[PDB]
């Protein structure tokens, strides 16, 4: 039933949109079993939830955290777990460092990274797109933004891979290293994000050291797997829609639109987390106080109410108002960076690769309801040099 949703079901992992459509048709609210989490599927309702920060707290994100893992309790929580009024203070501080200006200025380096990744494909007629392209790009870009020393880049990869007993070690090593980095940049700042986070000051208030480190950590967790997902999902959508791929390969100015339609069609973050603070009502369904609630961004983005023929992938549709990056106060800080990495990587892939096909018609999706991404994506294509 819609009151007995099993996210482990192979059909749900394969095609969650069938469940989502059934939920939207049936009820404003669904229930996951055995987690007991409440799911909200209709576009208007998802938007209402995200705009209602007083009724739907971000402390719900605590429900997503891996059990059996010891957290350094001197580390403040991720910004994504914080509610007003603390949230606004923190967000205004971190976005003095992680700014649209700093993201836009990365584009030349991002293009170079894209070209180097495609250089690794030369002389091959098949490649595995995740390991060779979509997984490295976000991780390389964020390590450069954070000022990671060249000799610590492989440790950073390992930490990144582990965050997608081992997990505890990687988290401890991440913070040990960035603590050291933070003290070095207090002495001699550079142009990197740690330096800029340390400098930030608003109304004579500054981030604590814990807050700097916690935000650094958030950027890996928040940014890597989701951006990887966007690029892989784009490759899946384009290979499923040959004529659209063909169109974009002939006109690279389409790529921003491709990216927006993948964001809507195969939303990387399929849902997010909230917790009700009171008894609340959505679409005449009451949700008890203290329930974990999953606003189903992916369901909202495929809601016929908002997006006509929503199961049609159409790079020429109007994508305005999709909720892939959320909405309102917690709207993705990384949204310009994700959009830029994806545009640049797809511009380079599309320009340099000839005919692109999947090896397999079947996509092996990662076994996550929460993040929609290919576990592997073997592709057939020929490279043309940069
Ligand atoms: C396609 C890629 C991405 C998607 C789909 C995505 C999606 C989202 C969503 C849905 C939220 C809102 C969470 C909420 O309301 O609880 C969010 C928040 C956030 N994302 Fe992203 N994101 C992506 C990439 C990035 C990247 C590249 C970064 C940074 C490098 C990043 C950093 C953040 C941060 C810091 C927040 C928290 C903002 C806050 O709580 O105020 N994200 N993301």
Residue numbers in the entry: 1 to 164, 176 to 397
Q: What do the authors of the reporting publication say about this deposited model?
A:
Here, we report on the identification, expression, biochemical and structural characterization as well as enzyme engineering of CYP109Q5 from the myxobacterium Chondromyces apiculatus DSM436. This enzyme was able to functionalize a diverse set of substrates ranging from monoterpenes over sesquiterpenes to steroids. Overall, CYP109Q5 has thus shown to accept a broad spectrum of substrates with different functionalities and size. Interestingly, CYP109Q5 showed only minimal activity with fatty acids, which distinguishes this enzyme from the CYP109 members that are actually declared as fatty acid hydroxylases, such as CYP109B1, CYP109C1, CYP109C2 or CYP109D1 (Girhard et al., 2010; Khatri et al., 2013).
In order to prepare protein for X‐ray crystallographic studies, the gene encoding CYP109Q5 was codon‐optimized for expression in E. coli and purchased from GenScript already ligated into pET‐28a(+), equipping the protein with an N‐terminal histidine tag. Crystals of CYP109Q5 diffracted to 1.55 Å and were in the P211 space group, with one monomer in the asymmetric unit. The polypeptide chain was complete except for a region G165 to A175, constituting the ‘FG loop’, which could not be modelled presumably to its mobility. The major difference between the two enzyme structures was an extended loop between N58 and P77, which, in CYP109Q5, has folded up to meet the G‐helix, possibly restricting access to the haem. The active site cavity is large and hydrophobic, with I232 and A236 at one side of the haem, and W61 and V80 brought to the other side of the substrate access channel by the movement of the N58‐P77 loop. V80 corresponds to F87 in P450 BM3, which plays a crucial role in the determination of activity and selectivity (Whitehouse et al., 2012). However, the position of W61, whose indole N atom is in contact with the haem propionate, is not a core element in the P450 superfamily and is thus special to the CYP109Q5 structure. The residue A280 is also part of the active site that is the fifth amino acid after the conserved ExxR motif the alteration of which also showed great influence on the enzyme properties. In addition, a big cavity could be seen in the surface display which presumably enables the accommodation of bulky and/or long acyclic substrates. The crystal structure of CYP109Q5 revealed flexibility within the active site pocket that permitted the accommodation of bulky substrates, and enabled a structure‐guided approach to engineering the enzyme.
